[PDB]
């Protein structure tokens, strides 16, 4: 049977499982490249830390854990997200 390529719903491009990342939240796979630009573009902003799914048509609307991002982006970048997390912590409990 045919297998190997998982395809992408972001850049509409085909890529090997080698350069892809399967989200263990919404069984959503995407090419590192995209996922990288996605989580990055978001963090870079500095308004929201939670890295939702890069898919607008996600019935599960999963999120991207920290572990994923950590690797996805580089230390220099991660930091930006790391600080963003704290900013939004215990909005009720002090
Ligand atoms: Zn892609
Ligand atoms: Zn998803």
Q: How far apart are the CA of 94 and the centre of ligand 2, in A?
A: 33
The helix (run of H) or strand (run of E) holding residue 52 is: strand 51-52
Tell me the CA–centroid distance for residue 71 and ligand 2, in Å: 19
If one counts the domains in the chain, the total is 1
Task: Label the pairing between strands 20-23 and 28-31.
Answer: antiparallel
Q: Which residues are known binding-site members? A: 8, 11, 31, 34
**Nearest-ligand number for the alpha carbon of 52:** 2
Phi, psi of 42 (to 5 degrees): -65, -60
| Domain that residue 3 falls in | 1-94
What CATH number has the domain bearing residue 72? 3.30.40.10
Count CB neighbours of 17 within 10 A.
12
The experimental method is NMR
**Ligand 1 mean position, distance from CA 47 (Å):** 24
Distance CA 16, CA 68 (A): 19
């Amino acid at each position: 049977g045919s297998s190997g390529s998982s395809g992408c719903k972001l850049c509409l491009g085909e890529y090997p499982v080698e350069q892809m990342t399967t989200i263990a939240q919404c069984q959503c796979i995407f090419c590192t490249l995209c996922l990288k630009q996605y989580v990055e573009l978001l963090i870079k902003e500095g308004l929201e830390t939670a890295i939702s799914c890069p898919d607008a048509a996600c019935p599960k609307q999963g999120h991207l854990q920290e572990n994923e991002i950590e690797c996805m982006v580089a230390a220099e970048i991660m930091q930006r997200y790391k600080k963003l997390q704290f900013e939004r912590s215990g909005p009720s409990s002090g």
